[PDB]
Design a protein around this nucleic acid. Structure first.
Lengths: 198, 310, 50, 50
RNA sequence: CUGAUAACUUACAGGACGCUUUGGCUUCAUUGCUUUUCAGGUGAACUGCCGAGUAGGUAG
């Protein structure tokens, strides 16, 4: 009971992570004008290097899906032929279902990240009682992480240029209606809702 | 010339630059680094070595040993070029003494050139070197960014006229020795990037490390700390920067080599002009254009020398 | 021997660092000293030939 | 169960037997061979000609 | 355009009986492998919040 409009990156020489990020940033520029969190992420040909050539925006009622692909970025990037839009096809009844959850537990492993964690643990050691020695906090030793295909986003009301990193793990075709965030998503704190990978 | 067996032994024997983190409690712990190996879905090991949170400052320790193994060649083969080189050394020692090379070799020990990139985004770094044989205190230096910059700043009363001698009396005297124990205190900012030496990886950023107190610590090379204190050569056709005192004067970062045999300034056009350079050092007066600049390089290359065979 | 070669020893081709694999041994940090032990034996096997 | 460097059995026999300074002129003790061979200066003194 | 032209060799079969290779033996003197070495993250993936947290979550 879902619709999906695929957009595919044409011109032979492009960084898909650099462009998919901008598409998600346009989706973040969207839906802080209208109070909704309904639109998907859905990377169909997600490889183990360079998240692939197209991106679809899976959602419900579809009166707010069509409006996202006429935002004068997609139209301007369709005029000069770099994108190619599919005209709102219903999802087929037999599909593979994946969750594109933003982990946010990889930027908490980096040295600047775990220092920030320790420095927050310092600040809430004033739940009184003499506090931890910061010498007894080691950069584990031999960490291993997979796979997370990191995209390059940035904040607007500050000059932080964060980045979000997303993994592909798949499960249990349907639960939710729909919820799942302003960066599309399959993470946001309650809804681990499958997206059906058009 | 080049008598099919002419090897030398190095005079300057540097050691590994061991890192230590000192705390506000005034106790020293070994610096530790993590290794992020990527695990692509159905080895690429990347290391990161940052200063841990709440650390007072960092201490880098190494021991350098100036010896007298440039007088006699190791294996000469022929006893015609043997007295040539020995005569050329003692004539150089007699005419224009070891003060210049001693100063050039000690200046880039006493300003933290052997840290390479740990001076970058550093508030202050203080060097304390203990010489041997010595009869007094530790020769300690102040903040080396404002104080000690030029040659004249290093030429202060109680810390230059006594440690250039013992290097001059090392290179001159037979079996002469000078063992300097150098300790440098880096005042780095909160979570500052420490850059140690990396392994070869014959085929991304795996660090060179050794075990201290049962845990691995970064090392900053054994040869990456001898190739820093021997960045002297600025006697090549025109002049740009101090290079590594090599045979063909090879620049590393820029891929080309200045002082190349087409120019005829390398350590084969100059070594084969030995018989000329004994004639020039006879009487007055040696010019500082193409004689002293060449003799400096000759001796700077004889200190590093081995092995000259063809 | 003993001229100059053809342009195979070019300036870009003499800045190509050649790798060695050598055994490095050093005194570990925080050691008191090194202790070297062996045994020698003087005998009377020069009186009569073997 | 740890490999360690050894300095050799035959090298330290060629250390405790560097006593030969009874050779045509004299400078330093050589290794006691037959043909008074010197290692550094590759030419051997005490040759069958002398 | 061939020493040309033409061309059915076929039936049946029991190698078996027996066997001691053995005696003796000293490889051992002497030994220096050594000289010299830059692997290279331009600044860059941040700052918060919830949580008893080297657990786990979260916004931008």
């Amino acid at each position: 009971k879902w619709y999906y409009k695929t957009i595919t990156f044409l011109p032979e020489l492009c960084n898909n992570e650099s462009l998919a990020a901008k598409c998600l940033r346009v989706l973040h520029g969207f839906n802080y004008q209208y109070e909704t969190r309904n639109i998907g992420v859905s990377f169909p040909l997600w490889c183990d290097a360079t998240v692939g050539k197209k991106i679809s925006f899976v959602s419900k009622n579809k009166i707010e899906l069509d409006l996202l692909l006429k935002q004068h970025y997609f139209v301007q990037m369709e005029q000069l032929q770099y994108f190619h839009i599919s005209n709102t096809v219903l999802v087929p009844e037999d599909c593979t279902y994946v969750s594109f959850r933003r982990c946010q537990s990889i930027d908490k492993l980096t040295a600047a990240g775990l220092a920030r964690k320790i420095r927050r643990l310092e600040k809430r050691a004033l739940s009184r009682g003499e506090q931890f020695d910061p010498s007894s906090f080691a950069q584990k030793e031999h960490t291993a992480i997979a796979h997370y295909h990191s995209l390059g986003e940035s904040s607007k009301q500050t000059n932080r240029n964060f980045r979000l990193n997303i993994r592909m793990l798949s499960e249990q075709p349907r639960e939710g209606n729909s919820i799942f965030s302003s960066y599309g998503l399959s993470n946001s704190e309650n809804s681990f809702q499958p997206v059906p990978l058009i | 010339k080049l008598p099919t067996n002419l090897a030398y032994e190095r005079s300057i024997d540097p050691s590994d630059v061991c890192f230590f983190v000192v705390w506000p409690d005034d106790r020293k712990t070994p610096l530790t680094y993590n290794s992020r190996t990527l695990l692509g879905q159905m080895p690429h090991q990347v290391d990161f070595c940052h200063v841990p949170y709440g650390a007072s400052h960092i201490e880098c320790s190494f021991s350098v040993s100036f010896s007298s193994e440039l007088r006699q060649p190791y294996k000469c083969n022929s006893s015609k070029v043997k007295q040539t080189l020995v005569q050329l050394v003692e004539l150089y020692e007699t005419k224009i003494g070891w003060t210049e090379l001693a100063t050039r070799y000690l200046m880039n020990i006493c300003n933290g050139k052997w840290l390479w990139k740990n001076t970058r985004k550093a508030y202050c770094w203080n060097i304390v070197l203990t010489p041997w044989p010595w009869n007094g205190e530790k020769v300690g230096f102040e903040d080396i960014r404002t104080n000690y910059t030029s040659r004249q700043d290093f030429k202060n009363n109680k810390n230059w006229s006594a440690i250039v001698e013992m290097i001059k009396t090392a290179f001159s005297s037979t079996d002469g020795l000078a063992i300097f124990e150098v300790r440098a205190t880096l005042h780095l900012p909160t979570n500052a990037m420490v850059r140690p030496s990396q392994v070869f990886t014959e085929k991304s950023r795996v660090f060179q490390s050794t075990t201290i107190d049962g845990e691995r610590s970064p090392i900053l090379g054994a040869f990456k700390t001898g190739a820093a204190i021997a960045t002297i050569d600025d006697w090549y056709p025109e002049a740009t920067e101090p290079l590594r005192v090599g045979r063909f004067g090879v620049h590393r970062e820029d891929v080309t080599c200045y002082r190349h045999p087409s120019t005829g300034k390398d350590f084969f056009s100059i070594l084969q002009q030995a018989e000329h350079y004994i004639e020039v050092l006879s009487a007055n007066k040696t010019p500082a254009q193409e004689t002293i600049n060449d003799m400096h390089f000759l001796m700077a290359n004889l200190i590093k020398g081995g092995m000259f065979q063809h | 021997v003993s001229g100059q070669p053809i342009k195979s020893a070019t300036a870009e081709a003499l800045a190509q660092g050649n790798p060695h694999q050598v055994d490095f041994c050093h005194v570990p940090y925080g050691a008191s000293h090194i202790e070297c032990s062996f045994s020698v034996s003087f005998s009377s096997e020069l009186r009569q030939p073997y």
